[PDB]
PDB file of N, CA and C in Angstrom:
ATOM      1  N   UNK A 299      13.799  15.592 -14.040  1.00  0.00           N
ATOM      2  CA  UNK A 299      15.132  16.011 -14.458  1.00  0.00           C
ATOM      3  C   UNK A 299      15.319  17.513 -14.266  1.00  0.00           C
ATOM      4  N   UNK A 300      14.656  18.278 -15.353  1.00  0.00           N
ATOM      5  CA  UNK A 300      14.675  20.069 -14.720  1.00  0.00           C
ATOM      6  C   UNK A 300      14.430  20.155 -13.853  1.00  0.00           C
ATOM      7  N   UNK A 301      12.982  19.797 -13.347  1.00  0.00           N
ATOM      8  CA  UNK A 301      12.824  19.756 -11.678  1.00  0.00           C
ATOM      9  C   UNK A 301      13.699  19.895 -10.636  1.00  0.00           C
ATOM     10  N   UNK A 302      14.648  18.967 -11.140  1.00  0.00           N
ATOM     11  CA  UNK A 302      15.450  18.583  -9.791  1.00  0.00           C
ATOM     12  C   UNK A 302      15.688  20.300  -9.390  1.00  0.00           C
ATOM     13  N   UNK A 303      16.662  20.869 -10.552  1.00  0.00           N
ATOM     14  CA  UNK A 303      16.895  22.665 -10.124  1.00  0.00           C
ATOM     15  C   UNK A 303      16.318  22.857  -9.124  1.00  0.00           C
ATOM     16  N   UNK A 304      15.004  22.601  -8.714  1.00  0.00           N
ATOM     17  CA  UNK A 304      13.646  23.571  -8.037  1.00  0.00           C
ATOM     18  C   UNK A 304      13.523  22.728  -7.052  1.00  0.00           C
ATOM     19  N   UNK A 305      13.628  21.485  -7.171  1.00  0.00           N
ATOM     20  CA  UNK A 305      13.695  20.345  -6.098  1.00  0.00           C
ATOM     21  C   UNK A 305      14.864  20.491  -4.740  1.00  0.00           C
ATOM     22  N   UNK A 306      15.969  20.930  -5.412  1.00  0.00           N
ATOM     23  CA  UNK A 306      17.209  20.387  -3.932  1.00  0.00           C
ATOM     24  C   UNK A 306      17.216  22.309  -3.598  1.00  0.00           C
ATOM     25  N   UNK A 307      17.098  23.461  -4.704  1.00  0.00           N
ATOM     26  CA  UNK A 307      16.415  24.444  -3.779  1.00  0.00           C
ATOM     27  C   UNK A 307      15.576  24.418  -2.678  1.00  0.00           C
ATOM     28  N   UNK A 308      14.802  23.856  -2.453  1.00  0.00           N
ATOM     29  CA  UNK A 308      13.835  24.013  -1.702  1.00  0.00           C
ATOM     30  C   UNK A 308      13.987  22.805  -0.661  1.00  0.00           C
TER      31      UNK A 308
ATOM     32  N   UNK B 309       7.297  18.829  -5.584  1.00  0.00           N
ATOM     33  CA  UNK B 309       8.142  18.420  -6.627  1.00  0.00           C
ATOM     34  C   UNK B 309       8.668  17.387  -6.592  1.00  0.00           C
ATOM     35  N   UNK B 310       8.854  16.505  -4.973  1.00  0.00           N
ATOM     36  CA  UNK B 310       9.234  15.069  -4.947  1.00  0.00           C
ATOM     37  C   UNK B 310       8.396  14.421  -5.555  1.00  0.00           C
ATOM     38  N   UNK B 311       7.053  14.328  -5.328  1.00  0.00           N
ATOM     39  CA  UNK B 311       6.484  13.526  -6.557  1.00  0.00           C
ATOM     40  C   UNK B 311       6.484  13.210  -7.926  1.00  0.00           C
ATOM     41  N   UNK B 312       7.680  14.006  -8.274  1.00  0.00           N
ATOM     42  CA  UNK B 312       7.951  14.106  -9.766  1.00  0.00           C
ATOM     43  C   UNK B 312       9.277  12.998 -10.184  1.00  0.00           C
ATOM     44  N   UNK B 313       9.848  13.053  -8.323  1.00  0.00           N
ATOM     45  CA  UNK B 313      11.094  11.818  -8.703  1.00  0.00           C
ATOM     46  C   UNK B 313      10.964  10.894  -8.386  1.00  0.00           C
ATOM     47  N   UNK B 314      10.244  10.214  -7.453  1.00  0.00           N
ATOM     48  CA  UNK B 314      10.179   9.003  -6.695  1.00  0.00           C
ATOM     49  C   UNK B 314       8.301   8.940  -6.586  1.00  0.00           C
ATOM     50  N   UNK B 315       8.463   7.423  -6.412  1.00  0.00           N
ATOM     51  CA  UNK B 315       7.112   6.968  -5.891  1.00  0.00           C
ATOM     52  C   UNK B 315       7.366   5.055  -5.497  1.00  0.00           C
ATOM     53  N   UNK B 316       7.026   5.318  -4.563  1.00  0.00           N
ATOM     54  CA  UNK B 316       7.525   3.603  -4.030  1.00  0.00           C
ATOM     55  C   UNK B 316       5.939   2.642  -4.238  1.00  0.00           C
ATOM     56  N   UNK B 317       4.689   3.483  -4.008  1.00  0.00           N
ATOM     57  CA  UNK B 317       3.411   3.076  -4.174  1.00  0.00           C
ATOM     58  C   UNK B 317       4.062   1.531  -5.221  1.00  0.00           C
ATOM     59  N   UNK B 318       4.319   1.272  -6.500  1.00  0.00           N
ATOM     60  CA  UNK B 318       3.481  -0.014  -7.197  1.00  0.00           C
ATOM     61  C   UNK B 318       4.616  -0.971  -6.389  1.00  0.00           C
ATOM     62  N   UNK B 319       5.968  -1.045  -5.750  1.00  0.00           N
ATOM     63  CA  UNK B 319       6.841  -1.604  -5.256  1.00  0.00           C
ATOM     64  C   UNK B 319       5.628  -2.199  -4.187  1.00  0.00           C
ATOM     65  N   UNK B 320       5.368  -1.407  -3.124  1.00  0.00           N
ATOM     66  CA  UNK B 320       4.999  -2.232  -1.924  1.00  0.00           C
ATOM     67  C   UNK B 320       3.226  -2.739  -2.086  1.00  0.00           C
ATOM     68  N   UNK B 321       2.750  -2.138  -3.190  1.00  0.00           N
ATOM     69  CA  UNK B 321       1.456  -2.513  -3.862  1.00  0.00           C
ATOM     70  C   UNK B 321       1.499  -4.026  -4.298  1.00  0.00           C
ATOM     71  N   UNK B 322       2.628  -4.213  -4.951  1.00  0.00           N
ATOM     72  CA  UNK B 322       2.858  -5.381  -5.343  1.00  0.00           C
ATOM     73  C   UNK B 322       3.284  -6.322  -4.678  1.00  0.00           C
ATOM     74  N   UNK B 323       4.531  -6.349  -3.758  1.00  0.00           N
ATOM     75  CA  UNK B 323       4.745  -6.484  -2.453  1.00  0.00           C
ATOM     76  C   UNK B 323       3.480  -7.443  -1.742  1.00  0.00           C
ATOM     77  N   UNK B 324       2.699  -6.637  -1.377  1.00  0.00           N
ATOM     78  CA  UNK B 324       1.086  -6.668  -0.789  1.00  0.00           C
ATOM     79  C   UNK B 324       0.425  -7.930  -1.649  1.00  0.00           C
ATOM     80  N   UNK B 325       0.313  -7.536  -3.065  1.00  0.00           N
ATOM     81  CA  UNK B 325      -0.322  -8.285  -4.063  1.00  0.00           C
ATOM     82  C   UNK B 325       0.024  -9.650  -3.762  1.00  0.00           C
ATOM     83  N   UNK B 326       1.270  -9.868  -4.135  1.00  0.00           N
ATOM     84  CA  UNK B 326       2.263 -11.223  -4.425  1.00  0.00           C
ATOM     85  C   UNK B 326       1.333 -12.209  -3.515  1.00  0.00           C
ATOM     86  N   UNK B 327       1.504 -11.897  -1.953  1.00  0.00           N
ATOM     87  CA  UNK B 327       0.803 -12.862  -0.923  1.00  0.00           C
ATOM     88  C   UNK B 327      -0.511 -13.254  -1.665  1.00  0.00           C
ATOM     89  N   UNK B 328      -1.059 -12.441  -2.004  1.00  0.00           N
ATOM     90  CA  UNK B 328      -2.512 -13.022  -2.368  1.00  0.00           C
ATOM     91  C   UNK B 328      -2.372 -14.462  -3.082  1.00  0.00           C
ATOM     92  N   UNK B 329      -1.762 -14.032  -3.973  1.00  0.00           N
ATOM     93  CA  UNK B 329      -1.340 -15.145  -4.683  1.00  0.00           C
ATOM     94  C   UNK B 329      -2.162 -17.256  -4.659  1.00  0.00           C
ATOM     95  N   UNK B 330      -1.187 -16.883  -3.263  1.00  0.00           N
ATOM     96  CA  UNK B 330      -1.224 -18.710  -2.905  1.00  0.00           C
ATOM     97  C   UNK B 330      -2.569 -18.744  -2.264  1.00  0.00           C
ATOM     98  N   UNK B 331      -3.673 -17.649  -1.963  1.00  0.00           N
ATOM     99  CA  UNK B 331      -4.442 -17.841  -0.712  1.00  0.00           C
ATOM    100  C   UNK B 331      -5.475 -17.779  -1.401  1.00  0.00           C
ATOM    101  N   UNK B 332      -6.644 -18.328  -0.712  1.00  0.00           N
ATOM    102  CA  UNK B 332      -8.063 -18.400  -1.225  1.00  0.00           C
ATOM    103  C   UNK B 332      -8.411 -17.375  -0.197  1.00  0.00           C
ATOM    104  N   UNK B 333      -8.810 -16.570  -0.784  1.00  0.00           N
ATOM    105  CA  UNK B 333      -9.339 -15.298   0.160  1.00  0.00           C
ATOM    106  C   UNK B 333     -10.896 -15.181   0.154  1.00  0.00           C
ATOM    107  N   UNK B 334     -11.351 -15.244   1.214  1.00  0.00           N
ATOM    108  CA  UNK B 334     -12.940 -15.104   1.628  1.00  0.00           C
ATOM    109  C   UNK B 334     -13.550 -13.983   0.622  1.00  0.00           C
ATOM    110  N   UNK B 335     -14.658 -13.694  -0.283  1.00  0.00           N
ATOM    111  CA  UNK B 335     -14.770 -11.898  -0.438  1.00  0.00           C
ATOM    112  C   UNK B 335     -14.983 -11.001   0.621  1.00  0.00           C
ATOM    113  N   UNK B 336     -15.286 -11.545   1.490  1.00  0.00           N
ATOM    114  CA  UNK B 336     -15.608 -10.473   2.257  1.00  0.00           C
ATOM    115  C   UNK B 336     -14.540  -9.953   3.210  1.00  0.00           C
ATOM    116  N   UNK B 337     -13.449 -11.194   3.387  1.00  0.00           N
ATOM    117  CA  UNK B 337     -12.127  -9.863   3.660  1.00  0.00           C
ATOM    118  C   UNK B 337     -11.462  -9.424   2.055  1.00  0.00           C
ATOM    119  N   UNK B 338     -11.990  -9.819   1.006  1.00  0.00           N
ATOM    120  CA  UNK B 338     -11.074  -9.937  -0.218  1.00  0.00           C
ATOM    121  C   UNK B 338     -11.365  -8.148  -0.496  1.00  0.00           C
ATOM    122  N   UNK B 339     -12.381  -7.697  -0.629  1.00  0.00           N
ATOM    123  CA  UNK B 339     -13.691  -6.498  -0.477  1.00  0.00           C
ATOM    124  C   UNK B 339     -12.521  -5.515   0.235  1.00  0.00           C
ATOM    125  N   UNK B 340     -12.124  -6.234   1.426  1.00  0.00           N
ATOM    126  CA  UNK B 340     -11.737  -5.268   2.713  1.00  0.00           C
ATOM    127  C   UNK B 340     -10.086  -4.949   2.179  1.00  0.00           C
ATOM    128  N   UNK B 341      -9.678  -6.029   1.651  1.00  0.00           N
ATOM    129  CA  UNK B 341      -8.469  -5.722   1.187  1.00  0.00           C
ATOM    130  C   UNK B 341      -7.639  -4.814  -0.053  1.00  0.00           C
ATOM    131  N   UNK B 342      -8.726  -4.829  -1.053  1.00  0.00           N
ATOM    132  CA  UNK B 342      -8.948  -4.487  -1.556  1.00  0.00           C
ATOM    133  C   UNK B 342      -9.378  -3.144  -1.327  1.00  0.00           C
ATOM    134  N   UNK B 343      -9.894  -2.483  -1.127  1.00  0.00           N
ATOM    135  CA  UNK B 343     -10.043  -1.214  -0.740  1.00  0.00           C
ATOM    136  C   UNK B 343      -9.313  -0.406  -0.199  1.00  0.00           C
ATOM    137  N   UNK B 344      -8.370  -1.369   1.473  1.00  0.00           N
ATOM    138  CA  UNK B 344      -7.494  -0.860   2.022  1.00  0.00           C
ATOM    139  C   UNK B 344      -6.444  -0.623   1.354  1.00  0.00           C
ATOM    140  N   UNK B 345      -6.256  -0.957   0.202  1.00  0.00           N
ATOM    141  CA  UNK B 345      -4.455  -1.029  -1.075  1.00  0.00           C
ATOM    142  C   UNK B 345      -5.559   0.436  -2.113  1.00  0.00           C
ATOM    143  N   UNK B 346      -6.743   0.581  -2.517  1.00  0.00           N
ATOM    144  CA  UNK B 346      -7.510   1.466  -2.767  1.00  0.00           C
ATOM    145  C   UNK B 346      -6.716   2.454  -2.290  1.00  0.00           C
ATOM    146  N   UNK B 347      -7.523   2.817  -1.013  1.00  0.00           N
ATOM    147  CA  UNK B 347      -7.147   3.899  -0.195  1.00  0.00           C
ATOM    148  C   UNK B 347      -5.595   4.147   0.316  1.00  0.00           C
ATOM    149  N   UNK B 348      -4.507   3.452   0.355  1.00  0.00           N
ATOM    150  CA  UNK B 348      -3.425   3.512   0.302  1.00  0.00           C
ATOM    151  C   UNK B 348      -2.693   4.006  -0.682  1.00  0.00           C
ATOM    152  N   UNK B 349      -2.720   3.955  -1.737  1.00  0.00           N
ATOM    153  CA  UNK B 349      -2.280   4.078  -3.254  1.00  0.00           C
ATOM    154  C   UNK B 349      -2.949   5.642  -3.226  1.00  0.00           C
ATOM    155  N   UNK B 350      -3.935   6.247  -2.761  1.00  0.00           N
ATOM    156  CA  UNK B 350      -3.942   7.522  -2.786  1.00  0.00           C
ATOM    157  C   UNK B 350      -3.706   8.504  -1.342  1.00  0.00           C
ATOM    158  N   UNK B 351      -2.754   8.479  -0.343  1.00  0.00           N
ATOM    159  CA  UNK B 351      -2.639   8.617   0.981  1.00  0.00           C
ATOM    160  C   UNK B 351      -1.119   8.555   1.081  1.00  0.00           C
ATOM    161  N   UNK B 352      -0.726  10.169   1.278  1.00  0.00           N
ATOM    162  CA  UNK B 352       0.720  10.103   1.926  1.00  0.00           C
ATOM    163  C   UNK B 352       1.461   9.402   2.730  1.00  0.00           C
ATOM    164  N   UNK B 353       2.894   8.419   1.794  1.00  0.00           N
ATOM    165  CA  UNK B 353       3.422   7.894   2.860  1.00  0.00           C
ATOM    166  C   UNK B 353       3.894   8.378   4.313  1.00  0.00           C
ATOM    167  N   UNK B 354       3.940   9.504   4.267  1.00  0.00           N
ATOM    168  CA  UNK B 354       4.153  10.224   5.613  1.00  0.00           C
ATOM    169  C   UNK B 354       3.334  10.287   7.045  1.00  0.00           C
ATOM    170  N   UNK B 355       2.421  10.123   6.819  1.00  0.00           N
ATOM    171  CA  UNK B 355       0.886  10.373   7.372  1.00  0.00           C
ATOM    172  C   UNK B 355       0.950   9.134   8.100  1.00  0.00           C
ATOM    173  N   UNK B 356       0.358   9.072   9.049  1.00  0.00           N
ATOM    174  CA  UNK B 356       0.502   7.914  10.450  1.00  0.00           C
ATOM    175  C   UNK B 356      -0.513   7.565   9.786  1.00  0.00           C
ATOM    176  N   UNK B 357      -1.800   7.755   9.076  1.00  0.00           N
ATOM    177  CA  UNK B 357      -3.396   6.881   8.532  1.00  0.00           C
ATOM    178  C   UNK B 357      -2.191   5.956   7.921  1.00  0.00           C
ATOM    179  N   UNK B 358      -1.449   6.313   6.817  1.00  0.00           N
ATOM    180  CA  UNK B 358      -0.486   5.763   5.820  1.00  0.00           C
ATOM    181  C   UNK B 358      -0.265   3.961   6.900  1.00  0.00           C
ATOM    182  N   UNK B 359       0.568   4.557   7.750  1.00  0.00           N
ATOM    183  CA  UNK B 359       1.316   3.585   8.502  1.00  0.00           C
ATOM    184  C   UNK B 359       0.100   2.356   8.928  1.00  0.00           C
ATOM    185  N   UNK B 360      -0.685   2.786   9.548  1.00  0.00           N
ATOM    186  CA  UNK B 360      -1.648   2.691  10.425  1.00  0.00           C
ATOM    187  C   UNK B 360      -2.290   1.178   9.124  1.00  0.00           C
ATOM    188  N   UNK B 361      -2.667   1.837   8.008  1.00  0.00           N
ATOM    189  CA  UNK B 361      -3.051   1.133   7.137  1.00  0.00           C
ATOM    190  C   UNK B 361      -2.339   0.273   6.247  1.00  0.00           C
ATOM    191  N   UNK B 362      -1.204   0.103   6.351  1.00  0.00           N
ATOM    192  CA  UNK B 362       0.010  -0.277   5.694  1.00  0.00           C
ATOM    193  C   UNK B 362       0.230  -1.601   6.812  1.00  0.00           C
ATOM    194  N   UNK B 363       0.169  -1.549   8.519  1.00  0.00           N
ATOM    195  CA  UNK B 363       0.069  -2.866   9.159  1.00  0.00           C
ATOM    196  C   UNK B 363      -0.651  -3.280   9.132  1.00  0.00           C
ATOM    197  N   UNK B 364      -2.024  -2.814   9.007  1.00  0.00           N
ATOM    198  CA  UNK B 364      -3.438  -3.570   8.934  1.00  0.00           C
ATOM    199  C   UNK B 364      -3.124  -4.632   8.042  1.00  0.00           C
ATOM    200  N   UNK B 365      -2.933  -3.797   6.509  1.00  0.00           N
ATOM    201  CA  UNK B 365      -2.620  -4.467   5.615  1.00  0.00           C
ATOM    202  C   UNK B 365      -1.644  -5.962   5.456  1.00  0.00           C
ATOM    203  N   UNK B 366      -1.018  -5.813   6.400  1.00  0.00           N
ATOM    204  CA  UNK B 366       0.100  -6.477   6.714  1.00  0.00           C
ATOM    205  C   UNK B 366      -0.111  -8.111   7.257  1.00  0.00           C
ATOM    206  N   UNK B 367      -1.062  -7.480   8.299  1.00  0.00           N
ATOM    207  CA  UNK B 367      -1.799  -8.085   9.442  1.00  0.00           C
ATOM    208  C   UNK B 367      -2.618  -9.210   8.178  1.00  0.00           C
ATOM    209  N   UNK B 368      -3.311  -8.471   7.839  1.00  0.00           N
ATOM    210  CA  UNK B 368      -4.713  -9.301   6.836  1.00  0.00           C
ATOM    211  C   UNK B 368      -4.140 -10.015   5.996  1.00  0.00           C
ATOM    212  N   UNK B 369      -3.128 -10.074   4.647  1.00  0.00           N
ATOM    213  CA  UNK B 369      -1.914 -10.777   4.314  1.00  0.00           C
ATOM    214  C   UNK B 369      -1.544 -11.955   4.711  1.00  0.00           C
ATOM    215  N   UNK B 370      -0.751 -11.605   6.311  1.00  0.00           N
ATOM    216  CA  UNK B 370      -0.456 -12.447   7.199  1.00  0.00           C
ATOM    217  C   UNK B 370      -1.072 -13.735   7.375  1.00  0.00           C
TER     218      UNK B 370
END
């Protein structure tokens, strides 16, 4: 879930 | 971090499994099969070994 933030950045 | 959202591994693990099911399997391909879903379950789906071992698998099933 937070991840995602850092996820579709990259 | 994709590993944190997705993982298809127990879908096609099981997939794999199901066939066993109806079949009387020799041990000594049972051994082989077994190992090959082993070594799959830790091996990037991306990776041609992945693929490579994923028809074997397929094949032996079959």
């Amino acid at each position: 879930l937070q991840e995602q933030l850092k996820i579709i950045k990259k | 971090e994709l590993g944190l959202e997705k993982d298809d591994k127990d879908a096609i693990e099981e997939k794999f499994r199901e066939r066993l099911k109806e079949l009387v399997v020799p041990k000594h391909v049972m051994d082989v099969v077994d190992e090959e879903l082993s070594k799959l379950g830790l091996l990037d789906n991306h990776s041609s070994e992945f693929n490579v071992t994923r028809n074997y698998l397929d094949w032996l099933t079959s």
